[PDB]
Symmetry: C3
């Protein structure tokens, strides 16, 4: 995968979670989110195609996605135990990290 | 993702496979299982938050998930060729590895 | 996951994309494709079980899957922006890379 594809996928999965009903619908979406965050962690963003792989912008771009995946894991564990409303609140809070990570590298 | 989220997801996907009908339902679940095992391989479990990354407990925790993903790949290849009953038997055997890996790090 | 499981999964997801209707059906399939390509990048194929990890056959087998995942990311970004027909054309072109990578390591 590439970068903006992962970002757009995180957005759309957050919306699906916003309109989900049962714990399975929330859980598979959160797993799609984890997959997209992982792929984006392996990606190269628009704002730094030719920086150094050891350049602070480059590796901060990836610590950002590790950070996002941690909150995703919190939300996943909530969804698996059936805590649907708790997981949806965790996801609406995930939105902030998603959006801030997005605009920082558009 | 984090650890117990992946473990709970493997459990739930194994149950879905236990109650699946066609090869697609088994195959996508087995791919969710592979994704969860991969994420858990990248995770830090409850029983060893502050061990060494080169501590035998730490890396054995991860060889365990590599081991699990191998059997998952067997089951996936069975499901893709349409061998639905074969893949479900492979998954009910996957349960043992899943559960033993679980209790070992609760 | 293992190798031929990932290859068969890429084939089947390409067929699902060939018969998809809305952007979500194309997008989740393309994400299953990215996941399978990633797993296969972490796999060991049939034609080189006991080569060197630094053997040119071995690492070329994996640059091939990095290459495949790049086109998958293109198709994902197309699907996320709602460009359904564009993403399906990108996938029917993905088929060539998939098949050539397949026969090269059967
Ligand atoms: Zn990975």
């Amino acid at each position: 995968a590439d970068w903006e594809a992962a970002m757009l996928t995180l957005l759309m999965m957050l919306k699906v979670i916003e309109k989900a009903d049962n714990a399975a619908q929330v859980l598979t979406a959160l797993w799609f989110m984890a997959l997209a965050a992982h792929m984006a962690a392996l990606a190269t963003p628009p704002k730094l195609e030719d920086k150094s792989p050891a350049s602070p912008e480059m590796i901060d771009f990836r610590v950002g996605f590790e950070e996002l995946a941690t909150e995703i894991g919190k939300a996943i564990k909530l969804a698996a135990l059936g805590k649907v409303k708790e997981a949806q609140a965790a996801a609406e809070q995930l939105k902030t990290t998603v959006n801030a990570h997005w605009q920082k590298y558009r």
